[PDB]
């Protein structure tokens, strides 16, 4: 079975790295220097490094040449045990379902629990249930 290797990356750039790697693979697959990488895992919960699947370290070492994003994680390639080949794909409860409870960060109802009522398919705005906290214009000027 193939092995899973780990490579460091920048914080906040994981989907861009994945799409760039896929573009590189598609552009350099019919040439004399193909890429032997099997797959890469970029979990959403983690932020700061990505994974890569390949048998030997030389494969990923020569497959990440030229890219300016993975330059930091180029002089060290760490290997994880075989027992860690199944916990990376695990996700603990996406997270978008109606009639569910969510919290807010901005606005005035900070650090408060609310409830979802309806979701717009346009993926631009979503309704929310909450009890008003204003003073009904009696204290403020």
Contact between 33 and another protein by CB under 8 A: the answer reads: no
Classify residue 9 by burial, with Cβ atoms within 10 Å: 0-12, 13-18, 19+.
buried
* Residue pair 50/14 in contact by the 8 Å Cβ criterion: yes
Q: Binding another protein by CB under 8 A: which of 10, 13, 53, 74?
A: 53
Contact between 26 and another protein by CB under 8 A: the answer reads: yes
Classify residue 60 by burial, with Cβ atoms within 10 Å: 0-12, 13-18, 19+.
buried
Q: Binding another protein by CB under 8 A: which of 7, 9, 40, 64?
A: 40
Q: Is 126 left (phi over 0), alpha (psi -120 to 50) or beta?
A: beta
Greatest Cα pair distance, the chain, in angstroms, is 76
Which stretch in 37-45, 61-69, 104-112, 126-134 sits in contact with another protein by CB under 8 A?
Answer: 37-45
Contact between 129 and another protein by CB under 8 A: the answer reads: no
Contact between 22 and another protein by CB under 8 A: the answer reads: yes
Residue 7 or 21: the one with the smaller Cβ distance to another protein is 21
How many Cβ atoms from other residues are within 10 Å of residue 16's Cβ?
12
Contact between 38 and another protein by CB under 8 A: the answer reads: yes
* Residue pair 77/3 in contact by the 8 Å Cβ criterion: no
Contact between 79 and another protein by CB under 8 A: the answer reads: no
Residue 37 or 77: the one with the smaller Cβ distance to another protein is 37
Binding site for another protein (CB under 8 A): 1-2, 15-16, 18-19, 21-23, 25-26, 37-44, 53, 85-86, 89-97, 121, 123
């Amino acid at each position: 079975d193939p092995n899973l290797w780990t490579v460091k990356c920048k914080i906040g750039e994981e989907r861009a790295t994945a799409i760039s790697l896929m573009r590189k693979f598609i552009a350099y697959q019919f040439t004399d220097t193909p890429l032997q990488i099997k797959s890469v895992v970029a979990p959403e919960h983690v932020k700061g490094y990505i994974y890569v699947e390949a048998y030997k370290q030389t494969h990923v070492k020569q497959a990440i040449e030229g890219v300016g994003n993975l330059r930091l994680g180029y002089w060290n390639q760490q290997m994880v045990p075989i027992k860690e080949m199944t916990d990376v794909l695990k996700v603990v409860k996406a997270n978008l379902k109606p009639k569910s409870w969510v919290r807010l960060k901005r606005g005035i109802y900070k650090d408060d629990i609310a409830q979802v009522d309806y979701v717009e398919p346009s993926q631009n705005t979503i309704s929310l249930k909450m009890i008003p906290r204003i003073d009904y214009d009696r204290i403020k000027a």
